[PDB]
Design a protein around this nucleic acid. Structure first.
Ligand SMILES: [Zn+2]
Ligand SMILES: [Zn+2]
Ligand SMILES: [Zn+2]
Lengths: 54, 28
DNA sequence: GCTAATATTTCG
DNA sequence: CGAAATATTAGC
């Protein structure tokens, strides 16, 4: 099975990868910085953002 | 250290030989 | 620098 | 295995 974005057309390596990509269309950003409240689509991008505070 | 593989054209560093290789092609 | 997104690697 | 993490990239 290919995990394609039926609603945008891009293909992805896994279902969870499709998940992350779908957030670019829905605006879902489940990872919120506890210091300033900026929201991110991925855990990894929030992690990097925390290093801009310390 | 962290990124031992360095591109002698632009000076960017990379964690693996392979990552350097794919970047090095963009200068060709 | 700092974000948005994804390709590659790692993980349990 | 697919999820998760990580490295990288594009953009400004
Ligand atoms: Zn899409
Ligand atoms: Zn913050
Ligand atoms: Zn270079």
């Amino acid at each position: 099975k290919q995990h394609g974005c039926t609603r945008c057309g891009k293909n992805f390596s896994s279902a969870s990868a499709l998940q992350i990509h779908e957030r670019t269309h829905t605006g879902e950003k489940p990872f919120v910085c506890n210091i300033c409240g900026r929201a991110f689509t991925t855990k990894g991008n929030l992690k990097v953002h925390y290093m801009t505070h310390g | 250290g962290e990124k031992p593989f360095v591109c002698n054209i632009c000076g960017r560093a990379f964690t693996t030989k392979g990552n350097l290789k794919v970047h090095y092609m963009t200068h060709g």
